[PDB]
Design a protein around this ligand. Structure first.
Ligand SMILES: COc1ccc(C[C@@H]2NC(=O)/C=C\C[C@@H]([C@H](C)[C@H]3O[C@@H]3c3ccccc3)OC(=O)[C@H](CC(C)C)OC(=O)[C@H](C)CNC2=O)cc1Cl
Ligand SMILES: Nc1nc2c(ncn2[C@@H]2O[C@H](COP(=O)(O)OP(=O)(O)OP(=O)(O)O)[C@@H](O)[C@H]2O)c(=O)[nH]1
Ligand SMILES: Nc1nc2c(ncn2[C@@H]2O[C@H](COP(=O)(O)OP(=O)(O)O)[C@@H](O)[C@H]2O)c(=O)[nH]1
Lengths: 429, 436
């Protein structure tokens, strides 16, 4: 189809994007320097979505590495797949961007968003058809919520027609170096919700919770977490990298999954919970997998599916396994507890299967859901932020950089409006 | 000796087209290279077979039809395939971006952009014709480039050719192959502006057709190359009268007039009970009588409904070879059992039966095979109210809370037309429950 632009900022999106790209480029199997390593043509049928030919009919992706701590360039080049990125999209500020808005949100880097917009434009020109933007960052601190959200403002200003997707990373007290996060979070959603299309609440909280309770790692570093996220997002992308019945596309994904123009906080999950183990280990079978799809442990966000009604349900399946039995299982899950699936929309669930197995395991599934249940995350942000704000804290920083307090109050009002709206939409019939 | 025009809109309308036109061409024996044993090497033909083919200096019989598809997928396959060579060169149109499950894009953003080129091709190709009875269109409900493009195209065409006709062969939504859930919105949002120009339509419910293929064709994965072969056989049967040669149901005008009880209500059910397992050698034996003996059951119809709970208007048929009209009238005597039949007081009833003498010619090695006989009931039964009622139920359930409305509202049409279209179909179903 058309072409899309990939955006990675901050540290989680910069490093996490690197690992994701590693995973996908390996499964699609093209050489780091671009020799054709793929072993079937079906691999290369759509790979133009995220890879582009060089001067010698050789794949070079279309991605943009943006950040402001100068150390990201070396840290990225020091990964496995760090070299292959285009040696002109490494646009970096050198003065550091310690986790404080309005230094990059307002003060500097507003100077540099012109440069990033110029480069992304000149990049997309040769894209024969433009399909949208792929932005990865973390709702945490400065860069990843500052430059990223300003960039969203600019791109929505310039390219209204195409769609905008966000992969969002929510920090939490368990693994949280800094302290000012809730301020940054609410400051970020108050622009995201009014300037995006659909979201991906890739929670750290429950994801660490998995790494530490059941996946049994007492020292989850930035190693393991990027493992899980690269797996999840690569799975999310496969519905697109492959052909299928539900050949869901960006616009189509939205319109099938977005009931109301605001409530687009998705809840990605993953059924074969995994370590970075040298072994697949756990045989996973489909009747079990379908049950696993809704497993509380399985999800990447802090919520209970049982306590929630799904606005829309989408599923993707992988490997060589019988298609008919899966459908049978899906009908079965819908029947036993009718409430979990919302009454408003009949037949919300959509099922497709992909021929190639995920590289590593035999047969699995990649969840992409959207319940009202997503409200629990936003309630934790609400509580934490409003507690830290009932009395002032650090507010001199933001204020003296040019902020105010009415922006904070309006952001918190926006948030609690959103959560009220979710609560209401999960109680009609 | 009466030409016509065919058309295929969307990737669903082009797939049906592809699965059908091989049946058409092979049915006459027209191969991509074949000599078509009844020709003159320059325009040789004008029998009912050539009534759809225009011959070049090579005596090529290139179809007077187009494939339309803004997102290029199936059409690209046609271009690689020999089928494009068989088709008239450059007649087909290739697009760039579909509306993707939203009627308004194909009706207010995307469809209008290329609709003029489409109608330009229509006009240029049409003026090559002289004896066109009407239009044969293939589409279904799903997106604005597959349901909205149709609506707009019918608007333009009905404006351009006031005298001419257009027959609809549309595909009905089903939960089982759901590639969206805006689909019911699409269906309503089209049919509410389709009756005003259409005059004769055909809905083949994939739901029921899926039920067929899963059970009695012994295919357990409903691939878009199983249902399509079966449905393409349906199309060959219904087109058979016009397409092959002289018999009953000569004309599209004849279709209308022997199926329309009222200009609005032009939804005829189609029936095709006689089926076979597969290329499998032998299962049993079967004669001309038994097949219509079993053409009554409610589970042998292209759309889920109980014909026993309704009354008919008119019922034509076709038969293939092996003539025995005496036993046909014997079947007429048998069907008086009335256990699933009932008619209307004021209107005279006709079980019109016409004959054609060709055994069913089909694809080399599909999920079906050779048999000796068949018959297809074209009942414009009032019972189709069931489908519209179920679709209304689903529509109201989804519309109680303004679902997805912005995904149409911001796309160049207002909201309230939902309500007027809903009441429009309410009037139509009122007309059903009244008739009788
Ligand atoms: C829905 O319920 C029913 C519907 C129809 C029937 C009987 C059904 N229809 C009529 O309405 C009969 C006569 C009127 C007239 C209509 C009202 C006006 O267009 C006419 C016309 C004008 C100029 C030129 C040609 C035609 O049609 C016809 O002339 C066509 C002949 C042509 C189209 C093959 O009709 C037939 O005779 C053919 C051989 C098929 N059958 C019928 O005999 C019974 C029932 Cl119960
Ligand atoms: N060929 C075919 N199509 C089917 C079948 N069952 C359902 N469809 C429909 O195929 C349609 C896909 O074509 P469109 O409706 O034109 O889709 P669109 O998004 O408007 O545009 P394109 O995908 O570019 O065609 C969907 O609406 C499905 O409902 C089937 O058995 N065969
Ligand atoms: N680097 C990294 N950070 C993560 C990840 N998951 C969550 N985080 C959190 O994201 C925040 C990092 O924000 P960052 O993008 O570095 O802000 P910056 O300093 O402005 O670039 C910290 O709170 C991390 O705990 C991950 O996988 N990688």
């Amino acid at each position: 189809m058309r072409e899309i632009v990939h955006i990675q900022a901050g540290q989680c999106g910069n490093q996490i994007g690197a690992k994701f790209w590693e995973v996908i480029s390996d499964e699609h199997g093209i050489d780091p320097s671009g020799n054709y390593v793929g072993d079937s043509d079906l691999q290369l049928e759509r790979i133009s979505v995220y890879y582009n030919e060089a001067s010698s009919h050789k794949y070079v992706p279309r991605a943009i590495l943006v950040d402001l701590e100068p150390g990201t360039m070396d840290s990225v080049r020091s990964g496995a797949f760090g070299h292959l990125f285009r040696p002109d999209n490494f646009i970096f500020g050198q003065s550091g961007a310690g986790n404080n808005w309005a230094k990059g949100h307002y003060t500097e880097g507003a100077e540099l968003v012109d440069s990033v917009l110029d480069v992304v434009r000149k990049e997309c020109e040769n894209c024969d058809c433009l399909q949208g933007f792929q932005l990865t960052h973390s709702l945490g601190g400065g860069t990843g919520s500052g430059m990223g959200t300003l960039l969203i403002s600019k791109v929505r200003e310039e390219y209204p027609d195409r769609i905008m997707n966000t992969f969002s990373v929510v920090p939490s007290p368990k693994v949280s170096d800094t302290v000012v996060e809730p301020y940054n979070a609410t400051l970020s959603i108050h622009q995201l919700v009014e300037n995006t299309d659909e979201t991906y609440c890739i929670d750290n909280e429950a994801l660490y919770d998995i790494c530490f309770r059941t996946l049994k790692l007492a020292t989850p570093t930035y190693g393991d977490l990027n493992h899980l996220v690269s797996a999840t997002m690569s799975g999310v992308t496969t519905s697109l990298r492959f052909p299928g019945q539900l050949n869901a596309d960006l616009r189509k994904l939205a319109v099938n999954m977005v009931p109301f123009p605001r409530l687009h906080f998705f809840m990605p999950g993953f059924a074969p919970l995994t370590a970075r183990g040298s072994q697949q280990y756990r045989a996973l079978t489909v009747p079990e997998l379908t049950q696993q799809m809704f497993d509380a442990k399985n999800m990447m966000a802090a919520c209970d599916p049982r306590h929630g009604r799904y606005l829309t349900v989408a599923t993707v399946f992988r490997g060589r396994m019988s298609m008919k039995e899966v459908d049978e299982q899906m009908l079965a899950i819908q029947s036993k507890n009718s409430s979990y699936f919302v009454e408003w929309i009949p037949n919300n669930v959509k099922v497709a299967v992909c021929d190639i197995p995920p590289r590593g395991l035999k047969m699995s599934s990649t969840f992409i859901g959207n319940s009202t249940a997503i409200q629990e995350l936003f309630k934790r942000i609400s509580e934490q932020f409003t507690a830290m704000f009932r009395r002032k804290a650090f507010l001199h920083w933001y204020t003296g950089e040019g902020m105010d307090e009415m922006e904070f109050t309006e952001a918190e009002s926006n948030m609690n409006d959103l959560v009220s709206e979710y609560q209401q939409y999960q109680d009609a019939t | 000796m009466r030409e016509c025009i065919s058309i295929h809109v969307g990737q669903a309308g082009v797939q049906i087209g592809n699965a059908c036109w091989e049946l058409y061409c092979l049915e006459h024996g027209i191969q991509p290279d074949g000599q078509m044993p009844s020709d003159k090497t320059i325009g040789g033909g004008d029998d009912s077979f050539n009534t759809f083919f225009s011959e070049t200096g090579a005596g090529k019989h290139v179809p007077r039809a187009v494939f339309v598809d803004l997102e290029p997928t199936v059409i690209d396959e046609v271009r690689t395939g020999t089928y494009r060579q068989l088709f008239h060169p450059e007649q087909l149109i290739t697009g760039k971006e579909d509306a993707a499950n939203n009627y308004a894009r194909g009706h207010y953003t995307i469809g209008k952009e290329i609709i003029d080129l489409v109608l330009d091709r229509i006009r240029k190709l049409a003026d090559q014709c002289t004896g066109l009875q009407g239009f044969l269109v293939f589409h279904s409900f799903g997106g604005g480039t597959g349901s909205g493009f149709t609506s707009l195209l019918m608007e333009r065409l009905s404006v351009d050719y006031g005298k001419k006709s257009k027959l609809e062969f549309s595909i009905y939504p089903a939960p089982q192959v759901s590639t969206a859930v805006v689909e019911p919105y699409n269906s309503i949002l089209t049919t509410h502006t389709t009756l005003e120009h259409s005059d004769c339509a055909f809905m083949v419910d994939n739901e029921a057709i899926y039920d067929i293929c899963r059970r009695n064709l012994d295919i357990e994965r409903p691939t878009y190359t199983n249902l399509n072969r079966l449905i393409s056989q349906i199309v060959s049967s219904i087109t058979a009268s016009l397409r092959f040669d002289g018999a009953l149901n000569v004309d599209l005008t004849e279709f209308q007039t022997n199926l329309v009880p009222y200009p609005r209500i032009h939804f005829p059910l189609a029936t095709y009970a006689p089926v076979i397992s597969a290329e499998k050698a032998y299962h049993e034996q079967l004669s001309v009588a038994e097949i219509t003996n079993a053409c009554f059951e409610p589970a042998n119809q292209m759309v889920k409904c109980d014909p026993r709970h309704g009354k008919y208007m008119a019922c034509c048929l076709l038969y293939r070879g092996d003539v025995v009209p005496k036993d046909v009238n014997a079947a007429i005597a048998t069907i008086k059992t009335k256990r699933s039949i009932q008619f209307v007081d004021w209107c005279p009833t006709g079980f019109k039966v016409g004959i054609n003498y060709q055994p069913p010619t089909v694809v080399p090695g599909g999920d079906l095979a050779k048999v000796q006989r068949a018959v297809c009931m074209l009942s414009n039964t009032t019972a189709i109210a069931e489908a519209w009622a179920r679709l209304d139920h689903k529509f109201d359930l989804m519309y109680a809370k303004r679902a997805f409305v912005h995904w149409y509202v911001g796309e160049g049409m207002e909201e309230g037309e939902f309500s007027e279209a809903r009441e429009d179909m309410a009037a139509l179903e009122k007309d059903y429950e009244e008739v009788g």
